[PDB]
Design a protein around this nucleic acid. Sequence first.
RNA 1: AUAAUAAUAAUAUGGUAAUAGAACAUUUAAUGAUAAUAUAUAUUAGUUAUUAAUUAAUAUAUGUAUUAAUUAAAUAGAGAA
RNA 2: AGUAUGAAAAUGAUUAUUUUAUAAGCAAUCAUGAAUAUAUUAUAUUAUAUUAAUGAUGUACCUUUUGUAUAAUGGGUCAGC
Lengths: 47, 239, 182
Amino acid sequence: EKTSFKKEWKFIPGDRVVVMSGASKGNIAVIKSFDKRTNSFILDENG
Amino acid sequence: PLPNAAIPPKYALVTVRSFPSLEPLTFVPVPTSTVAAPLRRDILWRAVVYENDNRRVGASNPPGRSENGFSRRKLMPQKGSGRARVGDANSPTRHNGGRALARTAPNDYTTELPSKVYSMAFNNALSHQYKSGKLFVIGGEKVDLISPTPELDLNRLDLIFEGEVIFRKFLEEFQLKGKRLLFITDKTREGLIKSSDPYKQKVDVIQKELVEVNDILRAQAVFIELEALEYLAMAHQKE
Amino acid sequence: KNRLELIPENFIGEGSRRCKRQKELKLAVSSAPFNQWLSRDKSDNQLDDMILQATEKTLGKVDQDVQFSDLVAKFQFTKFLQSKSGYLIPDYELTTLSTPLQFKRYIKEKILPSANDPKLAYKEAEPNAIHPFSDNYASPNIYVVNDVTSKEQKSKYDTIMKEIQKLEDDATRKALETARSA
RNA sequence: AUAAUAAUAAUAUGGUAAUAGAACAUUUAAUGAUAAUAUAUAUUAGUUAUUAAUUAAUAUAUGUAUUAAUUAAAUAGAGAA
RNA sequence: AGUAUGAAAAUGAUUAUUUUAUAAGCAAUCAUGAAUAUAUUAUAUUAUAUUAAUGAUGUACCUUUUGUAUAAUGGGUCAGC
Ligand SMILES: [Mg+2]
Ligand SMILES: [Mg+2]
Ligand SMILES: [Mg+2]
Ligand SMILES: [Mg+2]
Ligand SMILES: [Mg+2]
Ligand SMILES: [Mg+2]
């Protein structure tokens, strides 16, 4: 709860994003939502 | 009489330089006792070991059966159990217990050495360094220079910040990138230290009075001020 | 509606601060003000005349086998020698050797062999190092297998493979092009 | 007039309590090359008058020794409580 | 009582090789047939490894003792301390 940030994110749900260093590295995706506990994003249909 | 009874050579020449590059300015004659002493490795060993001993922190503090957490209760009666006899649960004989002959709080490993011997060792170290050709002396103001000190470079042993770059360049020039070096300085040349701190792992920068035999011996190439050198010589004289 | 690929042309930012700094440092190193009084390194023929030149510069017409007159003169000689040579001499050596001929001899003994053969040079990490060749053992049966580092060899192999790829592949491409043409 | 190795002749080489001398394993600190054809550990078969180390094959790590060696030290060696 | 990893041993089942139903005792050592396994110099009348034919030799270890196979002390085995 202290380590999680709240903006203080570098991105916001809705905007468009490029993903690298994964299995689909170099991907483009809309970030649909975030998971607060994990400080992570969920990406449209891609990523 | 006794034939073959010569008089020994009392001086040795050390070329003074200018520390960003290293351009030879003058020869200085330093006495044989501080720069051409025969290599007495045993003396050196005495010094180094002593130094190491004094440097120890000595924080080995396991719990003895006194300092160990358990109660003093006799776990089992003396007889009737059919088992081995037991005392308190702090005996080193049992896994949870204290340690036998425990070493306790600040352990003192400090040893003595006669001052004269230490001085001799220091001198010997210096001599060794000189013989290697890894002693480099830097200076100017005090002695008459044969060749005139060049421009854009001084004799103070001092320098993104530019200084760091210069230092790097110097290193590149002198083929001593990876090897460890020791700057023995007359005063706190802060700028120099700042420049060097990127290469901190392989660079010692030491004030005159605090230089150690170990530090010299460790160092693959030593850079010393002329004044500092003189001071050292005076300290570890002979008389 | 596509995967962009992460090539530095598509990137737009003021980041990579730790790399930028490094680059800057490199640049500085490449162009920095510095004395550098020993650029090119001294072959034995060169050495033979170098000493003579030094003598001419310093003391004029005097025998090389004869001793130095004064200390200042000696210093001048030695510095000059160092500068022309490229290799600086240990102060002990300077102190000891009392004639230009002697100096030359010393140089021949010490710094010449490492200049010609680079792997015969003196690495400080192993001072008791030894560098034998099949020639040194005065007998046909004795030989020394070549110490070529198992990394260097590998690198060479890789390079060769790359070259082959460049060649054969290129040829194939050419053939394809020809086919396309007619 | 030393050391290392090898000869020749001689004398000596059981051992509890005990005295004396010399080594090895393990771990930490100082100095320290090197390299996935390398290393570490393990199993098997070799080698060196052999508590040790090394060689070959095999298996598992690991982008790699506190590595060789000299010192300093030790929570330094276990079928016996 | 962190997480990975784990061909460490004791311990269980099973399979293979071998020995074993006329033979008697620290279960080893030495001699010595036979059977099996592996080996890119087994050229073989080969070499190693495994294995209780058969023969000889062989009172566990420690402790404490004037003295122990003792039916005197101590230990179920292994791992860690
Ligand atoms: Mg005896
Ligand atoms: Mg112990
Ligand atoms: Mg044990
Ligand atoms: Mg034992
Ligand atoms: Mg008896
Ligand atoms: Mg019992």
